[PDB]
Amino acid sequence: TAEAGITGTWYNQLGSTLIVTAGADGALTGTYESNAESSYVLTGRYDSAPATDGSGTALGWTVAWKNNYRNAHSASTWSGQYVGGAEARINTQVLTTSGTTEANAWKSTLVGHDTFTKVKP
Structure with missing residues (x-):
């Protein structure tokens, strides 16, 4: 199941x-x-009944960059899909928005991409 495949460390x-x-x-x-000092709360959602045709499992989550040791006044959201199997991956694209003045809103949001595996790089 997607539940079983996604749960754990990436x-x-x-x-x-x-x-x-x-x-x-x-x-x-x-x-x-x-x-x-480097640990932050994560919350998100995933498709708990994905397709069975070889398609990945859609998901996303958010981390606000605030904990007991730091506040970057920013939050990131990852949007992507889980792909199971022997070389399981979570493939994502990531938006990072910082709190800005109205004048600086044009530079409020970064875009990037993150690829997660079950084994360390």
Whole structure:
């Protein structure tokens, strides 16, 4: 199942660590790291009944960059899909919005991409 495949630890290309639980209901909950100072709350959603035709499983989550040690006045959202199997991946594109004045809103939002695997890079 997607629940079983998604739940656990994932690592991006840079070394950052995603620790997530996929609930039977469609909930994603966990933490995003990089180290306590580097750990942030994660919440999102996933398709809890995906297609069975070889398609990936749609999902997304948000991290607000505020914890007990830092506040960057910003939040990132990852949107992507889980692909199961021996080389399982979560393939994502990521928006990062910082709080700005009205005058600086044009430079409020970064776009990037993150690829997560079950094994460290």
